Amino acid sequence: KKLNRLAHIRLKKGRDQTHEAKQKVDAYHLQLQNLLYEVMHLQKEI
Amino acid sequence: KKQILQAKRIRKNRQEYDALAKVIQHHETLKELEALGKELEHLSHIK
């Protein structure tokens, strides 16, 4: 029982850290997408 | 930035082309002159 509880808690912590990393990567990707949209619109206007 | 320079060049070219188009606006003429010559020939025959 103690081993199962420890494993479940570790899995929850790992999933939380992965979700945090996913949010960070999504923010970076949104910044990069804004930059690419700016470049595309500037090439379209020019 | 290079594309902005190129767009400035293209805008200068478009301004020159618009100046040319406005200067021109400021085959059909030969056909109108031929019709006027035919009308003058008909008027000479009537006279």
Curated annotation (Swiss-Prot), chain A:
The chain holds residues 99 to 144 of 683 of the full protein. Signal peptide: none annotated. It comes from Homo sapiens. It is found in: Nucleus; Cytoplasm. This is THO complex subunit 5. Ubiquitously expressed. Phosphorylated on tyrosine upon binding to activated CSF1R; which causes a dissociation of the two proteins. Component of the THO subcomplex, which is composed of THOC1, THOC2, THOC3, THOC5, THOC6 and THOC7. The THO subcomplex interacts with DDX39B to form the THO-DDX39B complex which multimerizes into a 28-subunit tetrameric assembly. Component of the transcription/export (TREX) complex at least composed of ALYREF/THOC4, DDX39B, SARNP/CIP29, CHTOP and the THO subcomplex; in the complex interacts with THOC1, THOC2, THOC5, THOC6 and THOC7; forms a coiled-coil dimer with THOC7; together with THOC6 and THOC7, plays a key structural role in oligomerization of the THO-DDX39B complex. Component of the THO subcomplex of the TREX complex which is thought to couple mRNA transcription, processing and nuclear export, and which specifically associates with spliced mRNA and not with unspliced pre-mRNA. Plays a key structural role in the oligomerization of the THO-DDX39B complex. Belongs to the THOC5 family.
Curated annotation (Swiss-Prot), chain B:
Disulfide bonds: none annotated. This is THO complex subunit 7. Tetramer; as part of a THO-DDX39B complex. Component of the THO subcomplex, which is composed of THOC1, THOC2, THOC3, THOC5, THOC6 and THOC7. Component of the transcription/export (TREX) complex at least composed of ALYREF/THOC4, DDX39B, SARNP/CIP29, CHTOP and the THO subcomplex; in the complex interacts with THOC1, THOC2 and THOC5; forms a coiled-coil dimer with THOC5; together with THOC5 and THOC6, plays a key structural role in the oligomerization of the THO-DDX39B complex. TREX seems to have a dynamic structure involving ATP-dependent remodeling. Interacts with NIF3L1. The chain holds residues 103 to 153 of 204 of the full protein. Component of the THO subcomplex of the TREX complex which is thought to couple mRNA transcription, processing and nuclear export, and which specifically associates with spliced mRNA and not with unspliced pre-mRNA. Required for efficient export of polyadenylated RNA. Plays a key structural role in the oligomerization of the THO-DDX39B complex. It comes from the Eukaryota. It is found in: Cytoplasm; Nucleus; Nucleus speckle. Belongs to the THOC7 family.
